[PDB]
Amino acid sequence: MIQRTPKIQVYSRHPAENGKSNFLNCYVSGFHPSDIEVDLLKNGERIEKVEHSDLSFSKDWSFYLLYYTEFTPTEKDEYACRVNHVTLSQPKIVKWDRDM
Amino acid sequence: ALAGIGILTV
Amino acid sequence: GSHSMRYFFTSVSRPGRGEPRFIAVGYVDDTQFVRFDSDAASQRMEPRAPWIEQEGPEYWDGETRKVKAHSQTHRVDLGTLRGYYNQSEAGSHTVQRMYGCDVGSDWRFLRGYHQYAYDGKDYIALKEDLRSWTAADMAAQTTKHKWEAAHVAEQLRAYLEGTCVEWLRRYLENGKETLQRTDAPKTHMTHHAVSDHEATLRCWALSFYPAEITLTWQRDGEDQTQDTELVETRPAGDGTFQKWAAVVVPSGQEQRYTCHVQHEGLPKPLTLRWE
C-alpha cells in the first residue's frame, strides 16, 4: 500500500510586482494516492475560486496537480498554500516567498 | 487520438 | 527535437459511494490537449488546447465513445484486481495506465509504450520490442497469459508505430505555433544575505518551452550537485515552465560560482556569474 508525500511549491506565474495582476500557483507533485486537499490562503483566509489542472502522473506513477488563482500582490499581503494528504500527520503550510 | 483496440481488461 | 503523444488514465474506486472515478488526459510533448472526467456533467471528451478545438464533431464523438470504453474496462479491472489479491471490498484502490509514442526530430517513430500500475506499483508493461510483456507478479502473469492469447501486443503495435505516430504528426502541424515553438529561458540571478558570513545565490530559468532543461551551479567550474538546492521543473500555468537552483556561498566568494543553463531554445548553453 504505497504512500508517497507530496512535494509543494508556492509561486507566482510572473515576477511579483506590487499592484500588478498575476497568478498564484501551488504545484503539488510526487504523491500517492491521488486524494489530496489543496487550499490557497490570503492573510490566513482560504481563497475561493481556486482552480486546478486535470489529474495526471509522472513516469514513476506519482501524481501531480497545479492549483491556481489570479491575484494582485501588494507589500503587506501574505500568501500560502495548505496541503493535506494521508502521509501528513498535520496539514502542511508553505508560505509564499516572492524569491522562490 | 485514443487507441481503439488492445485495451482489454486485466 | 523529439516529440511524443501520451495518454494518461487513472481510476480510483470509492467503496459504498457509487461508480469509480475515472480521469483521462492526453498530451503532446508537455502540452495537454484533451481530458475526460467521469464526474463531469459533460460525459464528453473535451478540448484543453486551442489547436484541438478545430477538430469537428466526428473527432469528438469518436474520442468520446473510446474514452467511455476505456472507463468501463478500468471499472472491471478494479473488481478483477481485488480478486487477484484477495483484498477487502471496502478499501479504495487505484489503477493507472499510460501509453503512447515518441518520434525523433525527423518525426520518425523511436519507441512505443503501454504500461499499467496497481496501487502505484508496476503491474504489467509492454517491452520495447512491442512483442513481449513484463509481469513482476503472479497475478500480473495471469493477465500476461490472457493478453498473449488475445494477441493484444500485436494490436498495440499497429497503433503505437502507426496510428499513434500518424495523429502526433497531425497535431504537431495543426498546433505548430504552440507545439513547434522553442521558447528559450529568460535567466537572472538573485543574491540574499542569510547571515553576516553567508549569502544565497539563486539562478532562475523562466518562461521556457519545452520543459526539458539542465540547470546547475559550479564552484571554480567544478560540480556542486551535493550543495545545490534544485527545484523540480514546474508549470507557470501559461504553457511555459520555470525552474531554479540555489547554493549558499561564503560572503566574498560570489565570483567563484557559475550557473550553467542548457535548453533546446539556446543556441549555446549559458554561463552566468554574480559580478
Author numbering:
A (entry chain B): 0 to 99
B (entry chain C): 1 to 10
C (entry chain A): 1 to 275
Question: Could you share sentences copied from the article?
Answer:
Here we explored these issues using phage display to generate a high affinity TCR derived from the MEL5 TCR specific for the heteroclitic version of the HLA-A*0201-restricted primary melanoma antigen recognized by T-cells 1 (MART-126–35) peptide, ELAGIGILTV (A2-ELA). Remarkably, although the enhanced affinity was mediated primarily through new TCR-MHC contacts, α24β17 remained acutely sensitive to modifications at every position along the peptide backbone, mimicking the specificity of the wild type TCR.
We next explored the possibility that Ala substitutions could impact TCR binding by altering the structure of the unligated A2-ELA molecules. We reasoned that, if α24β17 TCR binding required a conformational shift in the peptide, then more energy would be required to reach the same final bound state, thus explaining the lower binding affinity. Molecular replacement was successful in space groups P1, C121, and P1211 for A2-ELA1A, A2-ELA4A, and A2-ELA8A, respectively, and the resolution was sufficiently high to show that the structures were well ordered and contained well defined electron density. These data discounted the possibility that alterations in the unligated conformation of the Ala-substituted A2-ELA peptides could explain the sensitivity of the α24β17 TCR to these single peptide mutations. Collectively, the structures demonstrated that the α24β17 used an almost identical binding strategy to engage the Ala mutants compared with the native A2-ELA and that the Ala mutations did not alter the peptide conformation of the unligated pMHCs.
